[PDB]
Symmetry: C5
Subunit: 147 residues, 5 copies
């Protein structure tokens, strides 16, 4: 079902075409699951995701984090990804809310395109992340108090 | 260990290996006198810690089961980092053992070899469950009585 | 327009020239967005950024961290970068304030120059970090309580 | 003279012979320092050390963590070691108690044996860790409030 | 003017000669900036630094962490350094106190000597760390509440 799940999606715009595709996949999963209505917020980069996810988790049962980090010529990629990983993990446990990871972390643009659910893509990580968010929210709802 | 309240949270990303880890875990629990641990499935390893956190509120030990296998991108690294960070935090926040039965392999062959199937070299799910129960019993004896 | 957001910038001066350039990009973005007078604080090294960002976050809607860490001969680069990543991530979530990462982490000085928005630079990370900080502050203000 | 310090030793039993060796080294140091009866607790694996160290820290002035993690064929070694590192560091600072790391992290068994203070070992990490725990506890006692 | 800053220095004893060189460098800067005799505490290893830095932070405006970690034959170096990085970053933010990092992390003894401010060293890390601690303390004092 999942139609009663309050879902938020925060998507980084850094690689616009790929981020738009991840967002499309997330929104289509939500729509397919009976949510035509998720809260959608855009941020500039992946690093801005956790603070916005933290705000969203106050008013939602699940948050999907979307974005694309692609390795460049420096170590910077490692640190961007470390920040996202540490931040989203903290947000999830602070708020006891699933924060689904649909942030691609690839070595090449081709790899990211192949994982964004564009027409020729092998998979759609934004869609996958949204399923995980919704499933976990439903699971937590059942585990928690009702009587 | 018949009095220990055990939860098992298992990611089903790689379904066959997850089922095998869970079977190992369930068998140990039963042999130890626990026929009815709380068992919860999640979709990916990333989802394990938030669910383990909820389980730790009502249990003496949680076993985390799953399988992460390296692909073509650095993504494997970040998934494993997230699980490590999350489970470590949950165990300390809740003062509850959160046993690690999450395989982190380069290949499917390696994961299979560690999931306690007929020809597997070992059963990580069983190992993690023994770890969880032993630690719960140890904590019970260290703590306040009688 | 960001004319109502309270912006602070904390910049490590370890590599002074590149710091200057990052700070210039940050200030130009802020000014373009209607903020002529952000709070600017200089520190001596990247390691010192988080504790100062922590303080700044008590009195601002967004903090931009600027700096340059360039790899040397030892593993030390890794741990400086780890510290910055861990610290800024913690500060952002503790304070529920965007702490934008304009801290370059490069293998070479050439790479850092190419990312500091000098005349022949490929990009300006200081400008990018400031756009991110401001956009995120504006986003959080709209997400949060208002009537 | 550590005769007044309350020492606990938590030792993982994975690689039992090396564990026994580390524990012997720790017990010998403790007895030399005036402590014939430290609290000794065995756990099955290194991952279990931090939660038990946390419990022990409530009732002791120092905890010595002993065990051995030896690399295998998969990345698993890395994550076990990361967990131990994150966990013991957290416990030490949460409890304001020294948690000495006597957990070996080796590529080979030969390496671990050479560091376990057996008759022909190069060093005795269990002994080292116990010295560190006791010395730090004594130092903290002096820095803290007394007459 | 840094003469009114309360400085603490915690130094590990592992690699005694290099630790002494770092501490000499720190003491010179402290004396050179006209500080009251800093609180100086010795610990056995770098792992023991954060818990003592935590205690010192309760009674000081800044803490300088000094030590030397040199890579050996096993992965152990990585985890010792990770622990230090994690611990010191946490202590600084928990206590809102600069904890300057003068902990060398080198592949060789030669590298560490070259960075320990001896007559023939390229760099003086003890000194650098102490300047960073003092400057950041002064910065925080000005940012914080006063006339
Ligand atoms: O979603 C993203 N995806 C990204 O790929 C990205 C982002 N964001 N940011 C910046 C961003 O995350 C923050 O907005 C910025 O740090 C300010 O906080 C980046 O600098 N990047 C580039 C990251 C990695 C590549 C770097 O290339 P070089 O090593 O510089 O060649
Ligand atoms: O148990 C798992 N095991 C896994 O192996 C796994 C999981 N889960 N998830 C996703 C998952 O953990 C989250 O559900 C998802 O990130 C949404 O939060 C993955 O993306 N993976 C794949 C991880 C690593 C392989 C990646 O392949 P590439 O690098 O993309 O070629
Ligand atoms: O902004 C920076 N950028 C930097 O590149 C930097 C900084 N700061 N600090 C020192 C600084 O971060 C701290 O002030 C210092 O640790 C005291 O706390 C550094 O030691 N560095 C040098 C870092 C990495 C290069 C190291 O060279 P070697 O490996 O020693 O050859
Ligand atoms: O002290 C240890 N020392 C260890 O070496 C160890 C331990 N413990 N555990 C398991 C253990 O830490 C936990 O008990 C378990 O994960 C359940 O929580 C391990 O799985 N190991 C093996 C770790 C690394 C080697 C792995 O080999 P492969 O990569 O699987 O070939
Ligand atoms: O300042 C240090 N500097 C150090 O270099 C150090 C320290 N300390 N400790 C131990 C120490 O940090 C702790 O006292 C110990 O873990 C007990 O808590 C170490 O084991 N080391 C050695 C670390 C790395 C080298 C290891 O050599 P192998 O890999 O064993 O060949
Ligand atoms: K929520
Ligand atoms: K798509
Ligand atoms: K319930
Ligand atoms: K519990
Ligand atoms: K099995
Ligand atoms: K704020
Ligand atoms: K510029
Ligand atoms: K609102
Ligand atoms: K204690
Ligand atoms: K021994
Ligand atoms: K202080
Ligand atoms: K010196
Ligand atoms: K002020």
């Amino acid at each position: 079902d999942a139609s009663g799940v309050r879902l938020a999606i925060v998507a980084s715009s850094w690689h616009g075409k790929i981020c738009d595709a991840l967002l499309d996949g997330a929104r289509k999963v939500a729509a397919g699951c009976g949510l035509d209505d998720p809260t959608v917020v855009r941020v500039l980069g992946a690093i801005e995701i956790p603070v916005v996810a933290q705000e969203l988790a106050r008013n939602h049962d699940a948050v999907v984090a979307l974005g694309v980090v692609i390795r460049g010529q420096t170590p910077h990629f490692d640190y961007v990804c470390d920040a996202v990983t540490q931040g989203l993990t903290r947000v999830s446990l602070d708020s006891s809310t699933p924060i689904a990871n649909g942030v691609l972390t690839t070595n090449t643009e081709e790899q990211a395109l192949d994982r964004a659910g564009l027409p020729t893509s092998a998979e759609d990580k934004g869609a996958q992340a949204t399923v995980a968010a919704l499933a976990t929210a439903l699971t937590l709802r059942e585990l928690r108090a009702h009587s």
